[PDB]
Swiss-Prot record:
Localization: Secreted
Stated name of the protein: Mu-theraphotoxin-Cg1a
Disulfide feature: 2-16, 9-21, 15-29
Organism lineage string: Eukaryota, Metazoa, Ecdysozoa, Arthropoda, Chelicerata
Comment field on protein domains: The presence of a 'disulfide through disulfide knot' structurally defines this protein as a knottin.
Known role: Potent and selective inhibitor of hNav1.7/SCN9A (IC(50)=610 nM). Also shows a weak activity towards Nav1.3/SCN3A (IC(50)=7950 nM). In addition, inhibits voltage-gated potassium channels (Kv) in rat DRG neurons. It does not alter the voltage dependence of activation, but it causes a small hyperpolarizing shift in the steady-state inactivations of Nav1.7/SNC9A.
Family to which the UniProt record says this protein belongs: Belongs to the neurotoxin 10 (Hwtx-1) family. 39 (Jztx-34) subfamily.
Tissues expressed in: Expressed by the venom gland.
Length: 35
């Protein structure tokens, strides 16, 4: 289980993939190349 882009991230291991748990709000995983 993981969250995709723009979804509440419980993990900072890019939740799903190619992502990153946005730590600067909104905390919901953003694209790794935009974080």
């Amino acid at each position: 289980a993981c969250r995709e882009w723009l979804g509440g991230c419980s993990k900072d291991a890019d939740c799903c993939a190619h992502l990153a748990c946005r730590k600067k709000w909104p905390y919901h995983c953003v694209w790794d190349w935009t974080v």
